[PDB]
């Protein structure tokens, strides 16, 4: 039970990191594409 | 105790990571705000 | 019980490491962007 609540909490946290970071990566990628486009 | 200690270690690590990621996200937000201003 | 404890401890350090590598790459990319923006503005 402690194992299982802590495992659930661990997955909840990782899901939240995953989404936050994919979004950051996505925004970073759009900025890099816009700068490349500018310099074209 | 061993479960409580793991919970604590995980929460402390997660908080410190949280602070650091919000700082990246702000740098991104500022760059976005600035590109938007340039394209105006 | 201990074995589960160890699994969760190992999963937390492996995932924490994988995120570390990931975020370091991102901090690099942001720095490159900021420096490029300062260069253009100078």
UniProtKB/TrEMBL annotation, chain C:
Bilayer topology term: Single-pass type I membrane protein
Protein name: Transmembrane protein gp41
Origin superkingdom: Viruses
Region of interest (MPER), residue spans: 1-22
Location within or outside the cell: Virion membrane; Host cell membrane; Host endosome membrane
Lineage of the species this protein comes from: Viruses, Riboviria, Pararnavirae, Artverviricota, Revtraviricetes
